[PDB]
Design a protein around this ligand. Structure first.
Ligand SMILES: CC(=O)N[C@@H]1[C@@H](O[C@@H]2O[C@H](CO)[C@H](O)[C@H](O)[C@H]2O)[C@@H](O)[C@H](CO)O[C@H]1O
Ligand SMILES: CC(=O)N[C@@H]1[C@@H](O[C@@H]2O[C@H](CO)[C@H](O)[C@H](O)[C@H]2O)[C@@H](O)[C@H](CO)O[C@H]1O
Ligand SMILES: CC(=O)N[C@@H]1[C@@H](O[C@@H]2O[C@H](CO)[C@H](O)[C@H](O)[C@H]2O)[C@@H](O)[C@H](CO)O[C@H]1O
Ligand SMILES: CC(=O)N[C@@H]1[C@@H](O[C@@H]2O[C@H](CO)[C@H](O)[C@H](O)[C@H]2O)[C@@H](O)[C@H](CO)O[C@H]1O
Lengths: 150, 150, 150, 150
């Protein structure tokens, strides 16, 4: 399923993002002078199951969760440098049941253990000066599709 | 290369659309009651090398070409019905040197013998009431990519 | 559909190779010091609809056709040097209805007009000492499948 | 990287199968009467990091590990039913660092937690009379490849 996720807006998944689900987010730009950019996987109740805060002007990428209302739990950060590849950077999220696997364009996958027991019913994209394009292309799979040779 | 082509707008290709190039256009919604929807592969001088006029109201899809300052050539026509797959219909275009191959979701491909000897420097998307989404995802390749087993 | 076409053998297709069909042949090796290597697409009556004779020594790649009991027709050739990429060289045959497109690893593809009005029922492979592996992997599609972003 | 893995034989990997690596194993046939079929991921020391024994008879698929000069540890087994899709059944193995993800054609992924802290340098295939074709097509990736929209 293909969705066009607009900045500071969101898309409702026609199907729950759950174990086996694969979400491939791709950007057609990558704005160097851009700042903090966020992607959130939302439960039906709109709790932030997976929060991805890309902070260029701070060389860090923060991963967290929190009830829509609640405060933020412990952060799980990793360096920002050498993660994305211009001009078409991307972010791939996979639901492995007990944790999320997140991959950028370079480096090893980041594994984020689930903290909130709910499937994602939507994906939000927030940014005041996004590092990416608006919208960003988003393909969501129910399962891992047959892979090409390269 | 990923581009986001908005309705009644266009996109400048990083490299020219030439022999071997593949363009994969994908929509995110498919509006069953949308009107005439067009896609134009434009040369540097704005010549319409390939014109794809999807006309649901006339149940036909028209292919043609014309120099910016010239007139349309004869029309290439094929039935519209049962060509697109909702909710994410697609259109693939491939430059085979002497002619373009156009594939939708179902049916046989369409071949349209080039009439202007030029490469494409951009692709336009036009519609007052479009069948597809704005924008449409467009992946441009320099050659056929590794094919998946499925 | 995946097949393992062994050298000096052939594989019977579960469905006819016809317009829109895609045969992606891949080798696990490139025995550069090899010799003449051939791939043939045969119809039910056993006519050779498409003959591809790769000759490293002569430094050319011959394309031809011939009926079951007939002599070869005129040849259509191209230089062989560097048309294949090690360690996994590939050949991709696509039926465009009136002609086949033959894709190697390098250089613009080659088109061959159909001489025999039949669909192929088997793909053959012959060689005294192949330039490729035995077998070669062959994925046959009824139509071009969705293309990955790259 | 493509390899043709023959039954009762193995293929020496170009690069180490390590975290991020993906191995797509595909067969051209499905021998319904076939007996126990095994695939082993081996360390340079020839220790069996991942052992996968498919037993149609006992309706089970066994996963284990052992040292070259060793006996089998406790078995992790799952039902054989609803895993393979003939005539081209597959098996995808992915190294997630602490564990291997294992996918067949049907059902949810299987996770086998690593027992031997070594990267695999080879992949073996053995059986008396295989359930799968000989050889099987194996595409090994250093990291997940770009995904087709569908
Ligand atoms: C340093 C700063 O100015 N603010 C930090 C906060 O950052 C927020 O982090 C959450 C996720 O943890 C989210 O990304 C939000 O958009 C950020 O502003 C946070 O780390 C804490 C309090 O939440 O304070 C500062 O560390
Ligand atoms: C009916 C009408 O107003 N115009 C018809 C022509 O339509 C144009 O067709 C070109 C491509 O050939 C292009 O799509 C343009 O936007 C259309 O207005 C044409 O279809 C026919 C053929 O002679 O003539 C006009 O009736
Ligand atoms: C060089 C040689 O020994 N024979 C040449 C011919 O080769 C045959 O070509 C047919 C297809 O055209 C087929 O490949 C057969 O197996 C080949 O032996 C032919 O290529 C040329 C004609 O230019 O004549 C011979 O030199
Ligand atoms: C003993 C025998 O001939 N077959 C079965 C055993 O097979 C071995 O099991 C190990 C354990 O993983 C490994 O698969 C080895 O390659 C096999 O030969 C064994 O699976 C079971 C008891 O665990 O007994 C026999 O059914």
């Amino acid at each position: 399923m293909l969705y066009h996720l607009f900045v500071n807006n969101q898309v409702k998944l026609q199907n729950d993002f759950k174990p086996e689900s694969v979400a491939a987010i791709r950007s057609s730009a990558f704005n160097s002078k851009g700042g903090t950019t966020v992607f959130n996987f939302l439960s039906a109740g709109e709790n932030i199951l997976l929060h991805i805060s890309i902070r260029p002007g701070e060389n860090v990428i923060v991963f967290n969760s929190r009830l829509k209302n609640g405060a933020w739990g412990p952060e799980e950060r990793i360096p920002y440098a050498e993660k994305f590849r211009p001009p078409n950077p991307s972010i791939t999220v996979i639901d492995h049941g007990d944790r999320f696997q997140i991959r950028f364009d370079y480096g090893t996958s980041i594994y984020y253990n689930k903290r909130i027991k709910e499937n994602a019913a939507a994906i939000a994209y927030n940014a005041e000066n996004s590092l990416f394009s608006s919208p960003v292309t988003v393909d969501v799979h129910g399962l891992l599709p047959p892979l090409p040779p390269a």
